[PDB]
Amino acid sequence: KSLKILFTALFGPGHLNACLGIGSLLRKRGHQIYFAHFPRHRATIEKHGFLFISLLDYAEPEFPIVDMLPDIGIIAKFAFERMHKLTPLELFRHASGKHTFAGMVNGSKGENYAMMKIVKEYKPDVCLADYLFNMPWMFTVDCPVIPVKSVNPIELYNGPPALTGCSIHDPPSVREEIEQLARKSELELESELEKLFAHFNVPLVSYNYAQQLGIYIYPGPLDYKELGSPKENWVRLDSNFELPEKLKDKPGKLIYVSMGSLASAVTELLTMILTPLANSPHRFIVSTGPNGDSIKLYDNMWGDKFINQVALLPKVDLFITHGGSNSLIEGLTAGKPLIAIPQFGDQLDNAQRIADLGLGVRLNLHEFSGEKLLKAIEDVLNDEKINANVARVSEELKKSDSKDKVISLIEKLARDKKL
Ligand SMILES: C[C@@H]1O[C@@H](O[C@H]2[C@H](Oc3cc(O)c4c(c3)O[C@H](c3ccc(O)cc3)CC4=O)O[C@H](CO)[C@@H](O)[C@@H]2O)[C@H](O)[C@H](O)[C@H]1O
Ligand SMILES: O=c1ccn([C@@H]2O[C@H](COP(=O)(O)OP(=O)(O)O)[C@@H](O)[C@H]2O)c(=O)[nH]1
After folding, report:
1. After which residues do gaps appear in the chain, with C to N over 2.5 Å?
2. Whole-angstrom Cα distance, residue 89 to residue 301?
3. Which residues does UDP-alpha-D-glucose bind (predicted)?
4. How far is the CA of 198 from the centre of ligand 2 (A)?
5. Dist CA 4 CA 32 (whole Å)
6. Atom of ligand 2 nearest to the CA of 14
7. In CATH terms, are 4-237+400-416 and 245-399 the same topology?
8. Pocket (CB within 6 angstroms of ligand 2)
């Protein structure tokens, strides 16, 4: 009856959360939880009572495990300079048939070898994995494997291409090109996946195929009901911060600013956003990121490298975000309107979904001005319809619950090896 359940995920701290939440639900039903990842996450995994397995302990000698987190600042700075210079359309034209994240595929060989060895050693009854793309080990190991998805799920539908930030309001003439480019770039992702799968002698699958079951986490009221149903076997899983003294005795609303764990490594991005907010008549709490001591703060601001974001969000009036999925769900669960300044990949889809459903505004780096940021703040704080829309979504998120259904499917698959 007690199952052995093994999780793993990509390097993003965001890619941990769905996995951690699903693991907590299964541990409460008496299952043994294992989580394979990097040492930096041992503390959170062991605090949850899951057994921590270090990917680094299982590397094949000639395929060292690529750890992308420490170098992310270099990659993130290149992405920032493209976003500040180019329109979304120009970004795709300049990409010239290269894909947003296919660059990561070749380097994934070491992690695949490690997971092969980990699943052979620990012999779990089922595995769950939150990746950007399927990996060969998911089709070679002796147990069922559930892909877990936390990125914007438009890629699970037959609609507008993923990673473009297409609007529901874009006419066919306006989008037909950016869409064609996105299609040529899907072929580069397939080509790189074909080389990774060939290396391991595994027949290639679609990058987001769910063989028996896939679990995606996205706000129900934001999901793409207008595109019909997600891909086969995918199911949606619906589940006191102390204010600094510096910001007391000061007028205006309280605003949280975060460009997320990864993009915040780019000090130039936060500096570009903060400078004009010195003149906004409100109070700002800032997640300053790992280089945060290099970031200048003004008299109306307080910040630290890593904020207790979930404790803070109920106390704020507005969330200035990069539009990452974890930040989107946390902000809307707390009932706070968003200004999304997207930085990379699925953040463009989330930013446009916020604008399209009246939950906030999208502000692009390529046409950014201080005047426009300050005006976005005043507009959203005073927009009774946006504040009503956000309140309605937060209520729906508090009520919606698919846990029993999804846990039953995981347990059924773990025991029967079929659904
Ligand atoms: C994995 C990387 O692959 C190449 O590089 C490409 C780069 O590859 C990635 C692959 C990824 O999986 C990610 C990435 C870049 O950056 C993402 C990112 C994260 C945070 C940000 O603020 C901005 C961007 C994170 C991610 O998952 O993609 C660019 C287009 O989006 C291309 O122009 C780059 O040739 C290049 O070989 C890099 O040296 C190598 O580290
Ligand atoms: O200063 C910070 C930055 C991030 N996070 C948490 O780290 C996770 C990932 O945040 P990020 O914005 O990087 O994720 P994304 O929105 O891109 O998915 C979430 O649970 C956030 O609440 C946090 O607590 N404090």
Report:
1. 239
2. 35
3. 14, 287, 307, 322, 325-327, 330, 346-347
4. 35
5. 5
6. 9
7. yes
8. 13-14, 17, 258, 260-262, 287, 306-307, 309-310, 324-327, 330
